[PDB]
Amino acid sequence: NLENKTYVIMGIANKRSIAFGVAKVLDQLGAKLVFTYRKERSRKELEKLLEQLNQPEAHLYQIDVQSDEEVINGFEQIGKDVGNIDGVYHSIAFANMEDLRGRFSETSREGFLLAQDISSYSLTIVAHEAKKLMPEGGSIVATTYLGGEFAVQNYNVMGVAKASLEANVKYLALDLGPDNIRVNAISAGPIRTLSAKGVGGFNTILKEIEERAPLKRNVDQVEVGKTAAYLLSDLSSGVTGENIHVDSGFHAIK
Amino acid sequence: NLENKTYVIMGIANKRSIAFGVAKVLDQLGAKLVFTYRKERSRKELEKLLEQLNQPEAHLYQIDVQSDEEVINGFEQIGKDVGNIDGVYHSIAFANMEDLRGRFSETSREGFLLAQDISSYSLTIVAHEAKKLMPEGGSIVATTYLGGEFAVQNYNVMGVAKASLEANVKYLALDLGPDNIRVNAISAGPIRTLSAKGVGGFNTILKEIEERAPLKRNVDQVEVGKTAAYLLSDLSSGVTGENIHVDSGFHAIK
Amino acid sequence: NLENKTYVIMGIANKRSIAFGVAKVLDQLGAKLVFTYRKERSRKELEKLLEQLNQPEAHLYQIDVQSDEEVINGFEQIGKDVGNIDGVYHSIAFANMEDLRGRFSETSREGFLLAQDISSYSLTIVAHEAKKLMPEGGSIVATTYLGGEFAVQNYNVMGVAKASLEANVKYLALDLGPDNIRVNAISAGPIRTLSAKGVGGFNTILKEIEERAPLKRNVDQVEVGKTAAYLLSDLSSGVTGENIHVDSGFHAIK
Amino acid sequence: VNLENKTYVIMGIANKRSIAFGVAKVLDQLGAKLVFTYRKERSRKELEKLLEQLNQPEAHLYQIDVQSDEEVINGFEQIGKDVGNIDGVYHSIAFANMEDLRGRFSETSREGFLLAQDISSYSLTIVAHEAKKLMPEGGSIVATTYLGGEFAVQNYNVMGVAKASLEANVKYLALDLGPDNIRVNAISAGPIRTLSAKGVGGFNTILKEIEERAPLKRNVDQVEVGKTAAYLLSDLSSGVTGENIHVDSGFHAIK
Ligand SMILES: NC(=O)c1ccc[n+]([C@@H]2O[C@H](COP(=O)([O-])OP(=O)(O)OC[C@H]3O[C@@H](n4cnc5c(N)ncnc54)[C@H](OP(=O)(O)O)[C@@H]3O)[C@@H](O)[C@H]2O)c1
Ligand SMILES: NC(=O)c1ccc[n+]([C@@H]2O[C@H](COP(=O)([O-])OP(=O)(O)OC[C@H]3O[C@@H](n4cnc5c(N)ncnc54)[C@H](OP(=O)(O)O)[C@@H]3O)[C@@H](O)[C@H]2O)c1
Ligand SMILES: NC(=O)c1ccc[n+]([C@@H]2O[C@H](COP(=O)([O-])OP(=O)(O)OC[C@H]3O[C@@H](n4cnc5c(N)ncnc54)[C@H](OP(=O)(O)O)[C@@H]3O)[C@@H](O)[C@H]2O)c1
């Protein structure tokens, strides 16, 4: 029961977004939710999607995590509009198509730094800013993929960005631990989302989970959200710097 | 919420046992519990601690995991008395102090195989027998320690037993995943229990956790129980073959 | 260059044995080699395979690693016959087919402990006995497989023995380090040997390596010997508790 | 491991204490022809001096700042024209502002974080792309990392995230260049007293700890990194790619 808890959810694009998974779960559990989006199309979208939840009001803030100004000012406003928060769910990443579709060794500096910037550094600046609204502690969760731990064909620059995010989680966990802010990752399995269309080989990878993961099935947004509810609540007190694979056990087999 | 769920908890000895941590949490959550024990003295303790729980009746079985017949017959008896179950919490290990207190290179054969038998093989046979009571699926959690992942001074033959256990979780997760039985481990940080008393250097490790781990404090049995509630419930439905560290982040640092 | 170095090599059964690839590389680099075997038939294969070696003397010793007396007496006689040694190559494992070709959850107790005993404990006792012949330090290498790190379908009870063995290596490395004795693992890719004939689905794994491993080909016994050469020698002086994958990179992908 | 007729580019020597100069002494001793890249003229001057300790009949020295595509591209092309086809690269390059390093990790600047990624990780990707052109037949790329890439090590801060990137960069390059028979691997070196080591808060207290706690109860040195580099760069390690060999007295294996 997360009543009288407040969470910030970053990265809803549409009904299929992983973070809308996390949203439905936290909403059921009685949390108050604040949302951040990048472009005005995701906002309109968000307003329509919000009619599906028991949120008594719409708390929506624009934050492109490439802008410090936007992250700093975004969290300040949230603080003034909503008070201290209990946690942040980070569901944000980006890479060029031009770089995803080339050979990994053909990645451009610009593309490689862009993916680092949006997919890994954004968590550091978000963690620094969100800390200001968690004076009594809290919990921050980011969404990673198995390709940050292994080379997964086609995942290329994003995998190096996830490897980076996954260490970001460990260093934020160590840094923010004494302030009672826990930082953790969920490694989701493959899920059909807007961003997933930009990864070459996605369907083939869907099929191989079905055939090979211990549970012989794929996962969904809602199973990610249920694990997110654990990481964001007191149920996981004691757990920090952790990466929980929500992926039908595929991480455990070779 | 675990009303209408039944779990088996193996390996309460007294009030400081990790498994009694788990018991309190599950009981608070509405679960029906069944308890298994090896020594008479542990049943006496169980009978006393039950008075602190909401369990309307004692379901206690003697199962010494060195004996197939006891595991088979115990689980069969459980099925007759409470019907189908939804999972098992395994909190059992053992090694001769004469091995634990030696140089690892001096471990006796009989002592090494004794630690494997009780600390690891026991999970396999518990799972095979418990599966018959989970025709619809369920969840099995075993308790491990960091020493199965890295060589920790003084943990000696038990580290090799926990490495074995941790792989046993993985092979079971794979084997039983198609049956919808999830198998996971909790890697508990150090906690004062009766068994901790046989580990050379224990108190030293307690203090190195407070100083060095991200959260700057040790964990307790109830915090293991909250992560057990998570692994044992539908909250963790896409998670199998996993090892969740309940250790103040100590696992993520070096 | 290994002139005036003496290594013991355990586990040659025939010309296809991984340990015979080790033998060829070390024999070629100038090393003196001492060979241990179990079956009378491995001694005969050894007597015949010594002909294509530069070994001017056959030093063959019956050691079944199930017997403490055998390992203890055999190393004492080795020390008496060839003096102090520089290193041990461990290439020994065993499990019942009956346990191998079953679901892992059906593994017998006696099958589980047989595999732990020969495939892991053998290393702990060999290390202890061979430390006596390494007053100035040396190097000890064992052979593992990726299935000790992840649940590889059909590998079953041997995966759990290999996870055990890999912990054994780390715990020996920590214990024996102050004596300047280094202890490491080679994780070999799949290789057609006599023992590979007991693992189900070995041919389909061969195929999958070629299709998927970074190098798109399988490896061989010599390639293991070449890494054994490195680890047994001073080239690897700051390296212990390590697991080197000789597997075309397959460990590094998913 | 005899390396005549072999040629290795060695990036990142700044003085006699550099890890890369460990690598040099070893390969030079095993008969390798060696080519050396550097950023600051100061390091080139240092290279000219250290070359007198080596067996190298001629000095092959190239200025490559890995922040510039041009200098990496023209560097390697220029290399290929001077000495021909190469057998491998030892990448011994990293950087991050002290400014980001001696502060809280959560206080890391974007510019600083991206700088660390640029010099310490991305540089591997472009070096490999350009060095491939001189390896039509196969070879070996080795990069240098630190345990703080795998675990949050106190004070390593932004460099730890950069090393995680590097270690993944090794894995993705291995997969990609595997079928061209180029192996890509990392050495995870123990702490060593170098110029760069002076950037890291708490460096001396870690040296002490290794010596008290690491299996071998002593620290490692640059020649030890070199002997492993010689293994990774040679045919001794056919079969081995996408791997990270910890040359650190066993410290990685303990907790
Ligand atoms: N789907 C999968 O199979 C899978 C698996 C494992 C991990 N993940 C991870 O899960 C997370 C969510 O992705 P998804 O698959 O759920 O796809 P998604 O719905 O398309 O979400 C990606 C989100 O990132 C936001 N975003 C991108 N750049 C941003 C920026 N600079 N500033 C602010 N927001 C930005 C996008 O917002 P706008 O639309 O407003 O631009 C979008 O909401 C990502 O971290 C992804 O790497 C996904
Ligand atoms: N305390 C810690 O810091 C720590 C950390 C990580 C993991 N763990 C793990 O947690 C689990 C429980 O340990 P604990 O610390 O809670 O200590 P504990 O209270 O002493 O419990 C150990 C239990 O194991 C049972 N057991 C031993 N051999 C058995 C056998 N042959 N058959 C059936 N049961 C047997 C004991 O039963 P009887 O007394 O009836 O014989 C006892 O109830 C163990 O796996 C341990 O490795 C402990
Ligand atoms: N082939 C592969 O794909 C593969 C992959 C990864 C790791 N490995 C490992 O490589 C090592 C060698 O196996 P292999 O593949 O080379 O097959 P192998 O040629 O059949 O060698 C197996 C050896 O184990 C010895 N052995 C078994 N039980 C013993 C005992 N109780 N006492 C003493 N020696 C005993 C056998 O000796 P006898 O014949 O005299 O009984 C035989 O020499 C093993 O550890 C195996 O797990 C193999």
Ligand SMILES: NC(=O)c1ccc[n+]([C@@H]2O[C@H](COP(=O)([O-])OP(=O)(O)OC[C@H]3O[C@@H](n4cnc5c(N)ncnc54)[C@H](OP(=O)(O)O)[C@@H]3O)[C@@H](O)[C@H]2O)c1
């Ligand atoms: N010492 C250790 O304890 C340790 C441990 C683990 C890993 N490492 C790694 O080992 C590698 C070598 O460092 P080291 O300890 O030997 O220190 P070092 O002697 O200071 O060498 C660092 C080298 O990096 C070069 N460099 C930095 N930025 C560059 C750029 N933009 N373009 C081209 N070259 C650049 C420097 O060249 P200039 O001086 O000419 O600019 C210098 O030669 C680094 O990757 C470091 O992260 C070191």
Ligand SMILES: CCCCCCc1ccc(Oc2ccc([N+](=O)[O-])cc2)c(O)c1
């Ligand atoms: C080789 C196939 C691997 C399957 C991929 C699993 C997965 C799917 C979508 C993922 O989310 C992404 C992917 C790309 C971008 N983008 O390019 O901007 C943003 C977010 C993901 O991380 C992870």
Ligand SMILES: CCCCCCc1ccc(Oc2ccc([N+](=O)[O-])cc2)c(O)c1
């Ligand atoms: C030197 C390591 C210090 C931390 C160890 C933490 C720990 C404490 C108790 C633990 O539980 C044990 C230990 C020993 C035995 N026994 O000898 O029978 C049974 C169960 C444990 O796994 C792990």
Ligand SMILES: CCCCCCc1ccc(Oc2ccc([N+](=O)[O-])cc2)c(O)c1
């Ligand atoms: C399903 C995985 C297929 C690849 C297996 C690679 C491999 C091959 C042989 C292997 O070596 C042995 C040695 C003995 C026994 N046995 O006695 O049953 C079994 C295996 C191995 O460990 C590992």
Ligand SMILES: CCCCCCc1ccc(Oc2ccc([N+](=O)[O-])cc2)c(O)c1
């Ligand atoms: C608390 C950690 C102590 C151990 C660190 C060992 C180590 C030493 C030097 C290291 O090399 C570096 C470090 C920093 C910079 N820089 O600030 O530009 C450049 C290269 C290193 O990676 C790694």
Ligand SMILES: N[C@@H](CCC(=O)O)C(=O)O
């Ligand atoms: N070395 C002491 C440490 C005390 C403790 O266990 O914490 C012992 O063996 O008892």
Ligand SMILES: N[C@@H](CCC(=O)O)C(=O)O
């Ligand atoms: N299926 C046979 C042969 C191996 C294969 O075809 O994969 C076995 O399990 O022994």
Ligand SMILES: N[C@@H](CCC(=O)O)C(=O)O
């Ligand atoms: N913290 C020291 C580094 C080495 C130490 O004294 O532990 C410094 O200010 O650079």
